[PDB]
Amino acid sequence: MNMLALTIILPLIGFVLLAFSRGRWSENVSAIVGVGSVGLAALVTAFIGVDFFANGEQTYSQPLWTWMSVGDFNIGFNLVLDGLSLTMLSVVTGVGFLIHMYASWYMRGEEGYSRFFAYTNLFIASMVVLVLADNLLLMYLGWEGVGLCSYLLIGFYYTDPKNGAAAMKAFVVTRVGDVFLAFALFILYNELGTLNFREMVELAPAHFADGNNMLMWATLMLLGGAVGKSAQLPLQTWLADAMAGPTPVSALIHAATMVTAGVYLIARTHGLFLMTPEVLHLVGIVGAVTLLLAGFAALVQTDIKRVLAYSTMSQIGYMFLALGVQAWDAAIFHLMTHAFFKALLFLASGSVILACHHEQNIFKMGGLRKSIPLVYLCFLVGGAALSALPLVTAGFFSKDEILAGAMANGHINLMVAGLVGAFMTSLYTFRMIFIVFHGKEQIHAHAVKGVTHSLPLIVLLILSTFVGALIVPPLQGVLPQTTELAHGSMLTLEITSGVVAVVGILLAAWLWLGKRTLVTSIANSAPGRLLGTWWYNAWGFDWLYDKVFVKPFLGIAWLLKRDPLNSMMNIPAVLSRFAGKGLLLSENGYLRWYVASMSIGAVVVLALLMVLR
């Protein structure tokens, strides 16, 4: 576990080498540096994991140097591994290696093959610092890092201005969450003067004994940071547009990393949310609302990537609901399972798009099940895991645990939201599947094959089945245990969940398989055209934000374009010039006036002398 830093140094070295290459290296050499860098980091993670379980799962700390020291403000560049970190490090470096390997095949022949891997390497390093940091300020160096790398990869195709707009929106919306996160860091230090996760939860109880009023503000501001990176209400308007970057990026910044940071944060700072129960419950409510709102939006999307974007929002919602119902172990379990099927679905979606000549509309495609078979199977296994098909898929075990925890803790209303979301998940997930692969061919896809493409796909496919549910995250010791549901009550939930999941898929088949007449009629119905438009635009949060923030800002920019305050400070000079011209009017060359001027002056001087005598 002494090699904990190598999990950051290796990816960071890969970035510098690929950045200074400036595209001079060959694609093969560039891929070896990009995939090998993350690959070696994953190998180090494996060796670290082996030593962690060998030493009895004891938390390990690796102090590197003191970052900032000004009095009691002592921030340290120190790393820590305890189990929650190991789980996250494994997902980041493991699933991160597979995506890098797949990306090697996807970006073949594209400009910036080296720059892409350079940025993905920096993203990995930033995410590793985020997960290994022992303090909130070092976590910030890594929280902001992943945001930059996302901006750099969402707009990788810089030639298209639309891709740049999507990248800027992501950075701005996420940075508004980072400002909220900062507030929490500012409050916690003013109140505890530590910022170290362990010291903070140890010194918090005594300081907030008189009143936790300031602790509630910190936890609320911690939730603000989480809803930004995790794309949860009210900062979820950036995920769908972020689907402008190369498909491999989508897999990394969704399943693997980035959107999981908010969950890790609330999980790492659980000891503080527990002292603020009302804010902790709000985490659950936010997840429930997002999972429901995002499901409807995904059901009406026509772009394959956007359906997978809103699904990530719903799936991150379940993990947020799990944290609010105090099912900490279930949330991390679902983060890991989600990292498998969602990466599979995104990587598979890339294969479909490339096979369909860059086509991305679910319609305009069809009958691909025969042309691309392995990709179709990946979608089936990934879609079943997302819809939580009973027993066969890992998603079933991870989601049921979330629903069980809510019921075990008395959050019935939230559990019900999860159940209805599960039905919606099946419908939106198989609607796309039954429209893209089942039906009549319309594009004639070109077979996509070769290792570097199939290997990552197959490994994620196995991990997306029940086999992934066997990878129990080591959490006892870091996170509290969840209240256990009674066996009889647990069986009822497991059966209900399965029936809801299956019924969803059956209805999806009957609706989007064959002539698709009923769905067309509902879609063309006046209510259908209205609700469909509303959901397609994600309930209109984007429109509202444009009218409340973007439009006002641009208006004020136009108003101040000519620096009004500078023009105000130019009045002293306009008056001066005017006065000068008026005074020069007395400079008429007429001598008789000059003589009269002295006469007037004499009268004034003598008059003043007499009135001031």
């Binding site: 950045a19 400036r22 140097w65 003191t66 970052w67 900032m68 020291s69 000004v70 009095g71 403000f73 560049f77 400009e111 300020l137 910030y140 160096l141 890594g142 902001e144 890092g145 930059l148 901006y151 707009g155 810089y158 030639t159 298209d160 201005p161 740049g164 990248a167 800027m168 950075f171 701005v172 940075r175 508004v176 980072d178 400002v179 900062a182 507030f183 860091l185 500012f186 409050i187 230090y189 003013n190 800002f553 004020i556 920019a557 136009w558 101040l560 374009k561 620096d563 305050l565 500078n566 105000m568 400070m569 130019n570």
Partner: protein, 505 residues
């Protein structure tokens, strides 16, 4: 003492630069480089011999070195110089930016280039004197003398594309803003000298003696405002900033004047070295107004930068937004905010320098600074576009770039004193992201918006790469290991912070 030579070497080198053009128009530049190199070496020697890291605050005044020589005995005015962790750090930055100011104007080998370098060396000599002067008259003299060389560099060696009329208009506006503001400060220095004599009976211009002058609340406030007006014009503090964008736009295109006379924080140091210590109670009661002026500059500067079209004027307004955070910090009385202000003053100098130097290099290739005539320059150049992205990432304050350390330290300290102001100020980080990305997208990304931007441009030279990469390494090191810089300014900033707080109580 060597303090006197940190000001003389620059001045002597300037005279040599002019007298050596006779040996060729390619000689003055080497004399200038050696001159600034020697000053920088002397500054580093003082750093390695002062043990600043092990100096504990003993209370103002606390100097590692000092020099005094009679100058005008009749008025008790002398050449009094003194160094401290704060002053030392500002002198070494002047040396570094001075060497870069010489290197940036290296391909300029026209006639009368000797006078150009003479003016450049004298601007730097005056800046170093401002950081070393502890005699109030010497401080003012250096404050006002450095403006004359700058006026002739912006008016005679200014933007090659601008007409003589536009360049002179800008130089006159800069001089009138700055010299007039400086005169308001002389009125306050003279009033303080007389108030001291009347209260005590001594006639002194020494800061050390004028430190505790018994004065009323009204006079202390008026004296404080007199110094602030001078430090508000050079910071700048809105609404006394109009001169900045114009001067930057019409200054030598290479960026020499920008780095030498506009990127050294002589006003922030002045507020920390004289205004806060000399007028502790007045500064405390003016804190609310000062802090709110800073918040306005943060948002006003950000909005103004977003709407600029000219890339150099965009960078100029970003400086007004960034300096607002330093003003808020100076009026908090918190060591954390003061230490962060020192880091931001150094970081902004390095980050702004890179942007200004890169802007000049870009002009040399596309012969335009209008972003509306650029685009897709990432696919037409080899280094400039990527390096400009780095400096903008640092400008928005990305952790790991040194600008973050200063900005966040200011907020952490400011929050403990003024929470509401800190909250509104932090939202400035979102506005920074808007103008920072706007510039990169409007110039290097997208498609070419003009023919000049649609052709492969010449690549950056080794000289250009070295100076820009040096700034990159320094910013990253300051971002990951800022302790060595914090340990040098701790004693000086501690002395100032204690004085202010203890005097107010």
């Amino acid at each position: 003492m060597l303090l006197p030579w940190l000001i003389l070497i620059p001045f002597i080198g300037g005279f040599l630069c002019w007298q050596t053009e006779r040996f060729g128009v390619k000689v003055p530049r080497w004399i200038a480089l050696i001159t600034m190199g020697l000053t920088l070496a002397l500054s580093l020697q003082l750093w390695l011999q002062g043990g600043y890291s092990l100096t504990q605050s003993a209370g103002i005044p606390q100097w590692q070195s000092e020099f005094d020589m009679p100058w005008i005995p009749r008025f008790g005015i002398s050449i009094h110089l003194a160094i401290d962790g704060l002053s030392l750090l500002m002198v070494v930055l002047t040396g570094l930016l001075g060497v870069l100011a010489v290197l940036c104007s290296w391909k300029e080998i026209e006639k009368y280039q000797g006078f150009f370098h003479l003016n450049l060396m004298w601007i730097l000599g005056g800046v170093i004197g401002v950081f070393l002067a502890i005699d109030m008259f010497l401080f003012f003299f250096f404050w006002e003398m450095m403006l004359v060389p700058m006026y002739f560099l912006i008016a005679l060696w200014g933007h090659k594309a601008s007409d003589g009329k536009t360049r002179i208009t800008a130089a006159t506006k800069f001089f009138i803003y700055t010299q007039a503001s400086g005169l308001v400060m002389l009125i306050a220095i003279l009033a303080l000298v007389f108030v001291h004599y009347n209260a005590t009976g001594v006639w002194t211009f020494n800061y050390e003696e004028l430190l505790n002058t018994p004065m009323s609340s009204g006079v202390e406030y008026l004296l404080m405002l007199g110094f602030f007006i001078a430090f508000a014009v050079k910071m700048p503090v809105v609404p006394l900033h109009g001169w900045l964008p114009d001067a930057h736009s019409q200054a030598p295109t290479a960026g020499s004047v920008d780095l030498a006379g506009i990127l050294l924080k002589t006003a922030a140091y002045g507020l920390l070295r004289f205004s806060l210590p000399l007028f502790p109670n007045a500064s405390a009661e003016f804190a609310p107004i000062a802090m709110w002026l800073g918040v306005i500059g943060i948002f006003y500067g950000a909005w103004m930068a977003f709407a600029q079209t000219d890339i150099k004027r965009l960078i100029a307004y970003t400086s007004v937004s960034h300096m607002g955070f330093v003003l808020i910090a100076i009026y908090t009385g918190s060591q954390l905010a003061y230490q962060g202000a020192v880091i931001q003053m150094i970081a902004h100098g390095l980050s702004a320098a890179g942007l200004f130097i890169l802007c000049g290099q870009l002009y040399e290739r596309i012969h335009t600074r209008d972003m509306r005539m650029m685009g897709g320059l990432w696919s037409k150049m080899k280094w400039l576009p990527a390096l400009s992205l780095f400096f903008a990432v640092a400008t928005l304050g990305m952790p790991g770039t040194g600008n973050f350390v200063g900005e966040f330290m200011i907020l952490f300290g400011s929050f403990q004193v003024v929470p509401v102001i800190t909250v509104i100020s932090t939202f400035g980080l979102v506005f920074a992201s808007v103008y920072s990305l706007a510039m990169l997208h409007r110039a290097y990304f997208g498609k070419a918006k003009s023919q000049i931007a649609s052709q492969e441009l010449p690549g950056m030279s080794l000289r250009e790469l070295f100076m820009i990469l040096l700034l990159v390494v320094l910013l990253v090191l300051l971002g990951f290991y800022p302790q060595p810089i914090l340990d040098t300014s701790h004693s000086a900033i501690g002395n100032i912070q204690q004085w202010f707080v203890n005097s107010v109580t």
